[PDB]
Design a protein around this ligand. Structure first.
Ligand SMILES: Cc1cc2nc3c(=O)[nH]c(=O)nc-3n(C[C@H](O)[C@H](O)[C@H](O)COP(=O)(O)OP(=O)(O)OC[C@H]3O[C@@H](n4cnc5c(N)ncnc54)[C@H](O)[C@@H]3O)c2cc1C
Ligand SMILES: Cc1cc2nc3c(=O)[nH]c(=O)nc-3n(C[C@H](O)[C@H](O)[C@H](O)COP(=O)(O)OP(=O)(O)OC[C@H]3O[C@@H](n4cnc5c(N)ncnc54)[C@H](O)[C@@H]3O)c2cc1C
Ligand SMILES: Cc1cc2nc3c(=O)[nH]c(=O)nc-3n(C[C@H](O)[C@H](O)[C@H](O)COP(=O)(O)OP(=O)(O)OC[C@H]3O[C@@H](n4cnc5c(N)ncnc54)[C@H](O)[C@@H]3O)c2cc1C
Ligand SMILES: Cc1cc2nc3c(=O)[nH]c(=O)nc-3n(C[C@H](O)[C@H](O)[C@H](O)COP(=O)(O)OP(=O)(O)OC[C@H]3O[C@@H](n4cnc5c(N)ncnc54)[C@H](O)[C@@H]3O)c2cc1C
Ligand SMILES: Cc1cc2nc3c(=O)[nH]c(=O)nc-3n(C[C@H](O)[C@H](O)[C@H](O)COP(=O)(O)OP(=O)(O)OC[C@H]3O[C@@H](n4cnc5c(N)ncnc54)[C@H](O)[C@@H]3O)c2cc1C
Ligand SMILES: Cc1cc2nc3c(=O)[nH]c(=O)nc-3n(C[C@H](O)[C@H](O)[C@H](O)COP(=O)(O)OP(=O)(O)OC[C@H]3O[C@@H](n4cnc5c(N)ncnc54)[C@H](O)[C@@H]3O)c2cc1C
Lengths: 257, 257, 271, 281, 281, 271
């Protein structure tokens, strides 16, 4: 094991990496104060793009103008009719994200969502993979995964994508665990299995964010180190409008100002 | 590699661990303010003992009384004549740490220093290992290593100790890298090889301690995870009178209040 | 290698309860004692459905299960004669039928899916052959035939039993490469009688691995040890299959319940 | 690539034959219904021609069973010898009494006290030329001064005359392999024979592991919860767990196995069959 | 346990024989002193009876050399074919001209442009039934849309008729093994033949690796700094680096090797000798 | 296995400049050309010392090196006759002598260390045999004899050449277990002539590994490839030895300089 970790470390200095940050429209102004403080410091990393959770039309323009980074908004299909194209979390009369990419393309660089542990509403794992292919075959050119913690399940899913012919990279979505109680709620609606070892690390830390920040680094740094070794040069961080972790992770990948 | 990190994580929840902290006599009162704030929070971990760098006679008593934790002072042989027994960093007329253990035993639980990468003044690696055996054969019962970053070199040194007959555990000394410039100066006087990958991680971080705290966690957490897997149940932290890292590391080992 | 099994074992608590199972029985020849006893022990597992092979009248077995057990039952299967059989099955409460060509002017499973769909909105299960059906002209033809079976109205794929998990995983990959949007449910046959398996495998063209034959030589009279060896093999297969994304399983119980019950328990399938 | 790894793990079993030594361990039957189970298990397991069988010793039921085993089956039977019960003079008499009855192997142990085994091994060797099997603890004995000291103690027990090593049962195979690699580093020329305990009972295992300091993995508990009344399923689960271990162990070059039968034969017989240890081989 | 691992790595070389295929790569000699070095290298390497030798093509010197090789040595010589220089009509004529001269293998490549190879492979197959060797990039080609796309492109080149794959040279063996494992996942039935470039010159290597996007490890630079004037020591260092790779590669089941000789024979001859490819075997 | 070499390679930049080397030559038989050429190429490496074997008068070789090169030189070696030889060596500027018993009323190296210490405060190098000197009654006796050699006044241990690194590392471990406080410096012999080695190894009882013989079969006329194969072997040994703590090396140059120079360069030993 000592040889494995040392091997992981010396192969990371042999790095050309693209990053992309994700923020969410704040609830209060204290959250909007914490966001722009994080938005100002993150701009120094020169990311490939940023994203806006889904109202949020006044963020893709503001970020594009108050700053100089390329912004892209999320867009669902809830309550509308005939560029992160999502179906959304629904109600009557649904259409699938593919229909949105087909529609939006008529008007762009489309980003779709991928689920290595299968979307909860998918009829099967085979159907959920075919749906991602036709989403790209509809006009998308950037694939972003839902957050995960079994890196193996990601690598097998990534291997099945090239097997189907998907020629675009399956960008892993990195979620640093800065609030475990929040993750549990997020995981309830995302059907992503939380490993047993991750929960054991965070019991008794519901009030010490500083230690949570330190423990979250080790988990996210380990994942990114393993992902980088296998050829992954694209990353998309779910910052949760915080910047301490996403900044430190990117620094390990050589992403520095 | 994904299987290796996941294997490292599930085997850590299968833990009975002893810890020991080390502090140094402050230079100013701002440092003494930061020390006792760290001394108050660290006491909750119930460590096996604490140590005091080498004046420092008014710390083993104060810590023992103002708090409830067992304190042990460092003691060199510089400028004296006929319980962390050290020879010290010298001048004329030297005696070796063994002579101190032989003397002090006449008056205790003695802790000696071990060097997996060999003490710089040792005639050879074989001599430096024999000297550690006779130090224990003189009456010591606790071995603490100088800080290291090649965990393999520690494991081979630990394997050579039982080969010589040393029946006491070789407690690894964990130094979380919270100030890389300080480490470089410490490493100049300690002859400990700093791995090339560690220096690459910390370039450009001479003013961002927060990211240094996050990166220091991943390195120290990785080491401790590998050390724990091989049977190590004893740890000695060089806190440098800081508590953010040592607290977070111990928490990963189950050491919690 | 030591880390591989430990990794395979820790993947079962990261599965919660997402595994679907389906049991298969056959109409008995003599006094039926092991058949009805095994349905009682399995009924607690809440399977997606159970099935009964068709070779006499096996409607009086699908009927008892439908009421005596409360489990969804599905029976295996001239065009006009089948129209009444399918209509009689539907009006009895049967919602699923496993449409198969059979062994004995042929009527192929594709035509049957076309027929059953005309009778009612059935949930049809078709057979897939990862080691190729012995009569297929090629592996590509047998893969196309499975596509046409699903495109005719089928919505459930069950595999012939196998023991080379590699050959299954490659086959399952060729199905999604061809566009098959349904999961290829593996058919698990726990080896409780190697002599039966050797004869069964000779007529189905399924390869018996050399390591499997060595495990069972000299056990033609020790049923207890075969059950114990069958546990290791079936749990091993199910462990790797589950880790690689298979969450549906179809057990060929052969009217025995000890192995399927223990296998399901490893997958979290419990009462 | 698990499906390929499991297939090569099974092909390796057919890449070995005739070199697998096995040994079985029984305990003195308390009642008389257990007497029937033990001698049924002995008759089933004796067809495997093991290297020896051993009988545990609590606090002279053991000595009579070892005698009955050698006279009714011809197997080399080895009693376990506790030094905590008697004095160095009584132990020399027992050692002479054991040797004159045809006993050529003793499992020399310190004992479960509610004087160490290196002294007992030194004593036995002084009396006669037995083969002496000693205990190893890959997860470290619960009362050792340190993990370093417990490894030296085993080294001293070998230096004192012991020629056979049997480990406490384990369930993390990697920590056995780490332990065996450390024993080869110290120069212990004998092989560290892994003790295999088929988990036929989880509530009883929880008691043994409680006393023995052996770590029960999280996945093993999740496999047995709810099976406290189903012996048939517990055996099928145990057969998977034990066969997996011995397949992995046999891959890394382990050709010697010790089985904690708990007077039961069905599991040990099946595991030996997987290893190629069969009546006709 | 490195001393034991290095010993088993060397014992494995003596656990293989007669199955190792090797192929050598030369480039058109610019001057006339290089002409002597190439034909000296050819005469030394031809005794190894390689599967074929190949000649690179810059922007018809290549075609004449392939002709001289086949007529003076009898080796199957394979020219490299660039699609960036000519049009689809000229390429069909060259393909017919190549085939009528006895050429049965072409290294079909897109080319170094200051139209892709799948189209060139499709073209060649339409003309005649050559064996077509295509390029693989375990560290990904510098101009691919993604690592996913470069792997599909190689898959399409195989589907188009190519029956041989040669990799860009590498120095992290693990990333070649990862790449080969991914090619087996996609079902590419041919083996990914690793291209071995003995580092006889570090300044020249820095130029190739610069163009090729191949990552030069930190340890490899520390081995050559200061040797910019000592060819004798550079060869001894290169022999260690290349032999280590092919020993590791031969352990993982690689039985095919391609060598970037740079018209030099001393290194390739020694590496082949380690692999058991010798004049008398 | 791929990770093992990569780990071995990254351990050379974590070594900085802590390696000590020592070269060994022998008085030539004919026209001496390769001998003096090799001393010039090696002199830039700043070795701890060089040595010259003794079989004629080899003082006129230790003398030239002492002045023409500026390197610390050490010569190999009746009791009264040796007293003047040791006294003549000391007053010439020689501070180190490699005291050996020799091959041809014996005088053992132990007695020589006792003698040389009586002459002056010499730095004595003794020979160690990890595969046991062929005439030792046992491995324990040959290990005790090395202890008595050091306890008589020696302060430097040099090993006979070897190729089983395991047997060396175990031997080096038995030395410290016996109390030997000095490092057991491995003697590295790069195999530039296998035919010489096979004959050399027959009279010294050092085992030639089977893989080494296979690497050199058919190379009795190709010196260039032997040099290339010798590089791989010698660098491989030196790589693992350095990683496991050996920082002193003694090369048997055999009056050749290509291999030792390249080996030293891998260890950071550079001008
Ligand atoms: C990176 C990322 C960012 C996100 N941002 C937001 C955000 O800002 N706001 C928010 O509310 N949510 C957000 N989500 C959540 C996301 O909207 C949910 O995952 C949603 O329920 C599915 O979105 P989708 O675009 O992947 O849907 P789709 O791609 O349409 O997939 C959803 C399901 O539709 C099924 N499907 C598709 N076509 C068919 C068909 N013809 N027949 C049957 N089934 C079909 C597929 O099987 C699949 O299971 C985000 C998710 C990710 C990964
Ligand atoms: C955990 C830890 C805490 C420390 N705390 C402090 C502190 O508070 N203050 C401080 O100033 N320094 C401290 N140090 C540094 C320490 O004092 C230095 O490493 C010192 O130079 C050696 O100490 P020692 O006790 O290991 O010396 P020793 O154990 O005596 O070893 C020093 C050297 O003496 C040699 N030696 C021993 N006997 C003989 C002999 N008979 N002949 C020849 N050589 C011999 C050995 O080979 C060895 O190389 C600490 C070090 C550690 C690891
Ligand atoms: C899970 C399972 C359950 C089974 N249950 C039963 C049962 O209850 N009773 C029973 O008797 N048997 C049963 N069988 C066996 C099976 O039904 C027969 O043995 C038969 O050989 C295969 O059935 P099928 O429906 O898949 O045939 P099909 O897939 O319809 O046909 C088999 C062959 O015909 C070929 N084919 C298909 N269409 C054409 C065409 N147009 N032209 C030419 N060739 C064509 C296919 O390539 C294939 O090789 C079962 C098999 C499985 C796997
Ligand atoms: C295969 C096997 C069979 C067993 N059979 C029996 C049986 O029949 N009856 C029974 O009652 N129990 C039995 N036991 C239980 C066993 O005796 C207990 O584990 C006991 O507590 C230790 O026995 P030991 O011989 O291994 O002790 P030892 O290995 O001799 O030592 C016991 C402990 O003391 C430590 N120690 C050794 N020397 C010293 C010293 N000088 N100073 C301080 N500490 C020291 C050791 O490190 C170890 O932790 C068995 C155990 C095993 C694994
Ligand atoms: C063994 C070997 C021998 C060589 N010999 C020569 C030689 O003789 N002469 C010479 O000039 N060069 C030579 N080269 C250099 C080589 O031609 C260059 O690397 C070239 O840039 C790529 O060649 P290729 O055939 O691999 O291209 P391809 O693999 O066909 O493709 C080139 C790039 O374009 C991408 N691509 C493929 N299809 C598409 C598409 N539809 N849309 C967009 N991008 C696409 C691929 O992913 C790849 O990144 C050689 C290289 C190797 C490894
Ligand atoms: C690095 C090196 C350099 C060498 N250089 C030379 C050289 O320049 N010239 C040359 O001629 N040879 C040389 N030799 C060879 C060596 O000197 C002889 O071949 C001799 O056989 C071994 O020498 P030694 O000093 O180690 O002998 P010793 O170690 O003194 O004796 C060899 C044997 O005697 C046994 N022995 C020692 N003391 C006693 C005792 N009291 N009673 C019984 N047995 C005893 C030992 O156990 C051992 O088996 C060299 C060898 C080495 C390894």
């Amino acid at each position: 094991y000592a040889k494995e970790i040392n091997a992981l470390n010396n192969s990371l200095s042999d790095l050309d990496i693209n990053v992309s940050f994700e923020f969410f429209p704040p609830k209060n102004e204290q959250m909007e104060t914490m966001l722009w403080d994080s938005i100002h410091r993150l701009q120094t990393l020169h990311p490939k793009f940023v994203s806006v959770t889904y109202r949020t039309h006044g963020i893709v323009k503001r970020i594009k103008q108050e700053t100089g980074l390329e912004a892209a908004p999320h867009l669902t299909g809830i309550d509308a009719s005939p560029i992160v194209a999502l179906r959304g979390d629904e109600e009557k009369k649904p259409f699938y994200a593919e229909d949105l990419v087909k529609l939006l393309r008529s008007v762009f660089d489309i980003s779709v969502a991928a689920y290595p542990e299968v979307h909860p509403e998918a009829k099967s794992a085979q159907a959920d993979l075919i749906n991602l292919k036709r989403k790209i075959d509809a006009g998308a050119n950037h694939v972003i995964t839902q957050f995960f913690f079994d890196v193996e399940r990601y690598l097998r899913f990534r291997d099945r994508c090239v097997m189907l012919g998907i020629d675009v990279e399956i960008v892993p979505g990195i979620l640093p665990v800065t609030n475990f109680k929040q993750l549990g709620k997020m995981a309830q609606v995302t059907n992503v299995k939380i490993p047993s070892w991750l929960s054991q690390m965070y019991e008794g830390l519901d009030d010490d964010q500083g230690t949570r920040n330190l423990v979250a680094a080790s988990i996210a740094i380990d994942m990114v180190k393993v992902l980088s070794r296998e050829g992954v040069k694209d990353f998309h961080f779910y910052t949760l409008n915080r910047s301490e972790l996403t900044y430190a992770i990117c620094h390990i990948l050589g992403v520095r100002p």
